[PDB]
Amino acid sequence: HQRPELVSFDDINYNDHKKVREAQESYTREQFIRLEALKTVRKALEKCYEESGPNHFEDCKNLAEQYLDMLPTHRLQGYLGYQRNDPSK
Amino acid sequence: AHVLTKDMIQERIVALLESFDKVNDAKNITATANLTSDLGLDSLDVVEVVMAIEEEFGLEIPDHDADEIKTVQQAIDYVSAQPAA
Amino acid sequence: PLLSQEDMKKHKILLAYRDRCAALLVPLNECRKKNYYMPWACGHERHEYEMCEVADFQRRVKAMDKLKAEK
Amino acid sequence: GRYPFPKDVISMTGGWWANPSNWKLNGLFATGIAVGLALWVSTATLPYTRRREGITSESDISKWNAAAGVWRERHGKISTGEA
Amino acid sequence: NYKWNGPLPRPHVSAGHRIATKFLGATMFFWMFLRIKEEYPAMLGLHNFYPP
Amino acid sequence: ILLSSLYLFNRILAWQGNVKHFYLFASNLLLLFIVVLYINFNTFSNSFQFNFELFNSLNPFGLSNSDISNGLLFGIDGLSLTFILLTVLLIPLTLLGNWYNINFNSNLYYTLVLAIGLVILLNFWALDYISFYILFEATLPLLFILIHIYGSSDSERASFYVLMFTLSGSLFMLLSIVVISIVLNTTNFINHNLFVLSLDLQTIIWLGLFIAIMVKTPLFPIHVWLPVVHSESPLAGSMILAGLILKLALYAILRLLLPLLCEAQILYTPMIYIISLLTIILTSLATLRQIDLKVIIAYSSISHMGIAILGVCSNTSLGIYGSIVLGVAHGFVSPALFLIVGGILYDRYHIRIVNYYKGLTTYMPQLATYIIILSFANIGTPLTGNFTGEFLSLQGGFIRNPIIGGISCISVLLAAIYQLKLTNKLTGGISSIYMHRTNDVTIREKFIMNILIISTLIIGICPQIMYNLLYWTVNNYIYII
Amino acid sequence: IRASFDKAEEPMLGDYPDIDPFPAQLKNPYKKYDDQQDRRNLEEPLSVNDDLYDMWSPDRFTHFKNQDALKYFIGFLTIFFGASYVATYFVPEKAAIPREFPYEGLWKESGGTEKSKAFFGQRS
Numbered sequence: 015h016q017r018p019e020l021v022s023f024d025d026i027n028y029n030d031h032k033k034v035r036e037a038q039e040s041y042t043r044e045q046f047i048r049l050e051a052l053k054t055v056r057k058a059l060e061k062c063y064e065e066s067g068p069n070h071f072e073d074c075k076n077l078a079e080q081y082l083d084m085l086p087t088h089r090l091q092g093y094l095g096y097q098r099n100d101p102s103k
Numbered sequence: 104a105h106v107l108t109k110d111m112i113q114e115r116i117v118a119l120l121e122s123f124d125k126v127n128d129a130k131n132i133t134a135t136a137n138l139t140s141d142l143g144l145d146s147l148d149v150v151e152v153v154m155a156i157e158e159e160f161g162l163e164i165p166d167h168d169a170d171e172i173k174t175v176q177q178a179i180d181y182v183s184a185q186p187a188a
Numbered sequence: 189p190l191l192s193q194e195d196m197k198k199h200k201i202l203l204a205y206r207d208r209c210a211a212l213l214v215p216l217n218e219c220r221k222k223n224y225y226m227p228w229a230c231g232h233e234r235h236e237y238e239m240c241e242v243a244d245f246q247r248r249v250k251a252m253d254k255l256k257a258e259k
Numbered sequence: 260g261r262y263p264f265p266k267d268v269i270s271m272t273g274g275w276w277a278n279p280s281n282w283k284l285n286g287l288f289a290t291g292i293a294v295g296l297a298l299w300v301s302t303a304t305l306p307y308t309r310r311r312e313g314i315t316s317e318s319d320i321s322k323w324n325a326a327a328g329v330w331r332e333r334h335g336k337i338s339t340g341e342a
Numbered sequence: 343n344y345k346w347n348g349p350l351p352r353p354h355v356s357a358g359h360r361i362a363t364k365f366l367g368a369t370m371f372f373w374m375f376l377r378i379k380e381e382y383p384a385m386l387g388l389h390n391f392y393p394p
Numbered sequence: 395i396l397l398s399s400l401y402l403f404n405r406i407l408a409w410q411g412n413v414k415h416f417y418l419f420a421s422n423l424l425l426l427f428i429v430v431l432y433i434n435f436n437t438f439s440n441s442f443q444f445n446f447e448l449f450n451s452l453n454p455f456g457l458s459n460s461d462i463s464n465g466l467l468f469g470i471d472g473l474s475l476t477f478i479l480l481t482v483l484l485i486p487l488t489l490l491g492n493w494y495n496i497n498f499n500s501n502l503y504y505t506l507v508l509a510i511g512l513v514i515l516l517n518f519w520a521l522d523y524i525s526f527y528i529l530f531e532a533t534l535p536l537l538f539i540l541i542h543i544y545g546s547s548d549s550e551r552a553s554f555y556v557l558m559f560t561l562s563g564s565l566f567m568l569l570s571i572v573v574i575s576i577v578l579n580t581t582n583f584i585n586h587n588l589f590v591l592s593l594d595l596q597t598i599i600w601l602g603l604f605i606a607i608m609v610k611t612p613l614f615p616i617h618v619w620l621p622v623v624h625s626e627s628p629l630a631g632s633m634i635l636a637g638l639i640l641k642l643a644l645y646a647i648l649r650l651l652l653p654l655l656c657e658a659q660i661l662y663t664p665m666i667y668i669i670s671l672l673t674i675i676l677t678s679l680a681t682l683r684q685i686d687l688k689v690i691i692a693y694s695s696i697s698h699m700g701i702a703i704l705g706v707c708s709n710t711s712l713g714i715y716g717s718i719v720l721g722v723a724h725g726f727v728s729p730a731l732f733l734i735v736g737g738i739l740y741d742r743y744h745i746r747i748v749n750y751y752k753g754l755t756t757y758m759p760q761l762a763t764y765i766i767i768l769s770f771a772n773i774g775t776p777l778t779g780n781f782t783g784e785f786l787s788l789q790g791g792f793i794r795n796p797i798i799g800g801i802s803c804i805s806v807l808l809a810a811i812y813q814l815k816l817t818n819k820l821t822g823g824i825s826s827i828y829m830h831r832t833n834d835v836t837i838r839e840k841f842i843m844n845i846l847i848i849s850t851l852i853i854g855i856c857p858q859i860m861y862n863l864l865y866w867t868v869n870n871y872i873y874i875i
Numbered sequence: 876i877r878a879s880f881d882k883a884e885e886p887m888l889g890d891y892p893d894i895d896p897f898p899a900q901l902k903n904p905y906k907k908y909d910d911q912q913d914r915r916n917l918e919e920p921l922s923v924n925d926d927l928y929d930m931w932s933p934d935r936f937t938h939f940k941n942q943d944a945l946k947y948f949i950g951f952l953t954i955f956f957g958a959s960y961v962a963t964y965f966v967p968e969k970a971a972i973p974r975e976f977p978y979e980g981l982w983k984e985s986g987g988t989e990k991s992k993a994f995f996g997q998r999s
C-alpha cells in the first residue's frame with residue numbers, strides 16, 4: 015500500500031516538474047481522503063436511521079447535522095485554483 | 104368459430120324481407136326478385152331495407168354501394184363478398 | 189399513566205402516537221404482533237385504546253366549546 | 260382462424276403460431292436451465308442478504324452520535340433553527 | 343340458429359357455470375349480511391363520541 | 395520489420411488484389427496492441443506515460459534522445475487512453491461495414507478509411523498544440539476525397555461542406571495557437587497549466603479556440619453542415635464522423651482550453667451555456683420536420699453533443715465524467731444507427747426518404763428489434779451508457795447554473811419525441827407498397843450491431859468501470875479556490 | 876393553401892405544385908387506395924407541408940371547432956375552480972380542538988433543541 019510524500023504548492027519552484035506533479039497529486043489525494051471521511055459519516059448516519067426508526071430525529075441528530083455540514087466542503091475542488099493563485103497576496 | 108354459407112345468407116335475407124310489412128307479397132320474393140319492381144318498394148323503403156340488412160349481418164354499407172344493389176341476388180352476392188359479416 | 193420518555197423511545201412508538209394514551213398502545217401493538225394483525229384478534233386491547241382516544245377527543249371538544257364560548 | 264405466412268421469415272420469437280414438433284424435449288431443456296439459473300442466483304446472492312434492524316448495537320450508534328457532537332463542537336456548529 | 347325473427351330458445355349454460363354463479367352470489371350476499379350484522383352500530387353511525 | 399512488413403503487404407496485394415483483408419488484420423492487431431498498452435498503463439499517476447518525440451533535429455527520422463525538444467511530442471494519460479480505446483474498437487467495424495457494397499476502385503476506398511482512422515488515433519496521442527493541430531487538419535482532404543468519390547447523389551456539395559466549414563473554424567483555432575506560440579514560446583500540454591496569461595489576453599485566445607470548437611462539435615448556429623455531410627457520406631465516413639471525429643472537439647475542450655485559459659473560461663461559461671441550450675432545444679425541434687433517415691440520425695448527434703458540452707463546461711467532477719461517458723456511449727450507439735439507416739436499409743433499397751418506409755416488422759423482425767433497441771438506447775434509457783452520460787452531464791449543468799440545467803432537462807422528452815416518431819413509423823403499420831421484400835439483417839450486420847449494443851450495455855450497467863482511467867481527469871480541470 | 880403556414884411557403888415554391896392540403900384522416904375510408912392504410916394513391920401530388928396532413932400526423936377532431944373546444948375546456952376549469960374557491964367561504968367550523976402532545980409538543984423527539992423549539996415542536 016503506497017503512501018507518497020505530501021508536497022505543497024507554496025514550497026516548490028514551478029520549474030521542477032517532478033515537484034509540481036507531486037503537489038498536484040497530493041492535493042487531489044487529500045481531497046479524496048476528505049470524500050472518504052464524508053462517506054464514513056453518511057454510512058454511520060444510514061445505520062443510525064435504520065436502527066432508530068421513529069426516534070432517529072433524536073438519536074441521529076449529530077450525524078445528520080454533521081453530514082449536512084460536511085457536504086459543501088468535502089467534495090472535489092481541483093488543484094488549479096490553488097496552484098494558479100497565491101492566497102497571501 | 105362461426106362461418107356463414109351462401110344459403111344461410113339467402114335464408115336470412117328472405118326471412119328479413121318476409122318480416123317487412125310494406126312489401127306487396129311474401130310468396131313472390133325470389134333470389135332474383137327486384138325490390139323496386141316486383142316487390143314495389145319505394146325509394147326510401149329500399150333504403151330502410153339496406154339498413155336492415157346491415158343491422159342484421161353487422162356490416163357497414165357505403166352510400167355508393169348501397170344504392171347499387173337493386174335485386175336480392177345482388178344483395179346476397181354483396182353480403183357474401185364481405186369477409187367479416 | 190403518561191409513559192416515560194425512555195419508555196416511549198424503548199418501545200419505538202411513532203411520534204404522532206406519543207400521547208397520554210400510548211401506554212395502552214404498547215400492549216395493543218404487542219398483541220397485533222403476536223397475532224398476525226388479524227381482525228378477529230386483539231379485541232380487548234384495541235377497544236381499550238379506542239376508549240382512551242374517546243376520552244382525549246372528548247376533552248378536546250370541551251376545549252373547543254370553551255374557546256367558542258369566549259367569543 | 261389462421262392464414263398463410265411467409266416461411267422464410269425467421270424470428271427469435273418463433274413467428275406465426277410457433278409450435279415446434281419437438282417442443283416437449285426442448286421444454287425439458289429450458290426448464291432445467293431455468294431451475295439451475297434460479298438456484299444459482301438464490302444461493303450466490305445469499306451472502307449479500309441482511310436484515311435491516313438489529314445489525315449494529317446501541318453502543319456503536321450512541322458513540323457515533325457522541326463523536327459527531329464532538330466534531331460539531333470542535334468546529335463552531337449551532338443547530339438548525341438555533342439562532 | 344334455426345329460428346330467425348322469432349322467439350329465442352332458453353340459453354344452454356353449463357352446469358358448472360350455474361353452480362359457480364350460485365356459489366359466488368350466495369357467498370357475496372351472505373358475507374354482506376354477516377358484515378352488516380357485525381358492524382351495524384359503527385357502520386350506520388351510533389354512540390356519538392361527543393359528551394352529552 | 396518495416397521492410398519485411400512492406401514486402402508482406404506488396405505480395406498480398408500482388409496475389410489477392412484486394413487490400414481489405416490486410417487492412418482488417420492490421421487494425422485488429424492495432425486494437426490488441428492498445429489493449430496490451432492498457433495492461434501496462436499505471437493508473438496511480440497523473441503523468442503522461444508512453445512518450446515519444448518525432449522529427450527532432452538530432453534524429454529527424456527516429457525517436458529523440460536529445461536534451462533539446464524541438465520535434466513533435468506524443469504521449470498518453472488516462473483521458474487520451476479512453477478515446478484511443480474507443481477509436482481502435484471502432485476502426486475494424488468501419489472496415490467491416492462496407493465489406494460488400496464497395497465494388498469499383500475498392501482498394502482506394504479502404505485505404506482512405508484506414509488512413510482517416512489512423513490519423514484520428516494519432517491525434518489522440520498528440521502532446522502539443524502544433525502536433526494536435528496538424529493531425530486535426532489532416533483528416534479534411536481524406537474526407538473530401540472519400541465523400542466526393544464514394545458518396546451518394548449530392549456528395550460534391552457534401553465534400554465541399556466538410557472541407558470548407560472545418561477549415562473555417564480551424565483557421566481561427568490557428569490564430570489562437572499562433573498567439574500562444576509567440577507569447578509563451580512553448581506549445582506542449584505537459585506544463586501549460588503553469589503559464590498564467592493576463593486575463594485580457596486569455597479572453598482573446600479563448601475566442602479563437604471556441605470558434606473552432608463551435609464548428610467542430612458542432613453547436614448552434616454553425617451546425618448546418620453536419621446533416622448534409624452525414625447524409626451524403628458513404629457508410630464508413632458517417633461512422634467515423636459521428637463516432638470519432640465529433641469527440642475530438644470534446645477532447646479539445648479538455649486538453650487545449652481548460653488547463654490554459656481557466657479564468658477566461660470562468661468568465662465565458664454563461665455564454666457557453668446559452669449556446670448549448672440553444673443547440674439542444676432548437677436542433678431537437680428541427681429534427682421533427684425531417685424526411686431523410688440519415689439526416690434525422692445526424693441531427694440527433696448534435697443535441698447529444700450539446701448535452702455533453704453542458705457537462706464538460708460545468709466546473710464539476712460529475713459533469714466532466716458525464717461528458718466523457720456520454721461521448722463514449724454516443725460513439726457506440728450513433729454508428730449503429732447510421733449502420734441501420736445508411737448501411738442496411740440503403741443497401742437494400744437505395745433511398746432515404748421517410749415516406750417510402752413503413753411496417754418493416756413483418757418481413758424483417760430482427761431488424762425491427764435492432765431498431766427498437768438502438769432507439770431506446772439513443773434516447774437515454776437507463777442501463778445504457780447514454781443515460782449515465784446524460785444524467786451526469788445534466789447534474790453538473792444544473793449545479794453550474796440551476797435555471798439553465800433545469801431547462802436543459804427537457805432534452806429527455808425532445809429526444810424521445812424525434813427518435814420514437816421515426817421508429818414508430820419504421821416498425822409499425824402494414825408493409826410498405828413501394829418496396830419489395832428483401833433479406834433480413836445478415837450475419838455481418840448483426841455482428842457489428844451486437845458489438846455496439848454490448849459495449850453500450852456494459853458501460854450502462856457499470857459506468858464505474860471507466861473510473862480507473864479517469865479519476866485524475868475529473869479533478870484535473872475544475873477551477874475552485 | 877388553407878392554413879397560414881402553408882400560405883407562408885407560397886413565395887418558397889417556384890415550379891412546385893401549389894397543392895390544397897386535406898388531412899388524410901378525413902378522406903373517406905371506403906374509397907379504394909393503392910395504400911389503404913395511408914389512404915394515398917400512387918403518384919398523387921404532395922403538399923409542401925404534407926408531413927402535417929398524412930395519416931401519421933396528429934389526430935384531428937371534427938365535432939367541435941378548435942376555438943369552441945377551447946372555450947369549453949377553459950370554461951370547465953373556470954367553473955370548477957371558482958366554485959370550489961367560493962365554497963371555501965361557506966364552511967362549517969369544527970367541533971374538537973386539534974390534538975396536543977406532552978413535552979411542549981415533543982420538540983425533543985422531533986430533533987429540536989432548547990434554543991430552537993419553534994422550528995421543531997408540536998402544539999403542546
Ligand SMILES: CCCCCCCCCCCCCCCCCC(=O)OC[C@H](COP(=O)(O)OCCN)OC(=O)CCCCCCCCCCCCCCCCC
Binds near residue numbers: 509512516528
Ligand atoms: C500525414 C499526417 C501528419 C503526419 C505527422 C505525424 C506522422 C507520424 C508517423 C506515425 C509514426 C508514429 C507511430 C510510431 C512512433 C512510435 C514508435 C515508438 O517506439 O514509440 C516510442 C515509445 C517509447 O519507446 P522507447 O522510449 O524506445 O522505450 C521502449 C521500451 N521497450 O513507445 C511507445 O510507447 C509506443 C507508442 C505507441 C503509439 C501508438 C501509435 C498509434 C498509431 C501508429 C501508426 C499511425 C500511422 C498514422 C498514419 C497516418 C498519418 C497520420
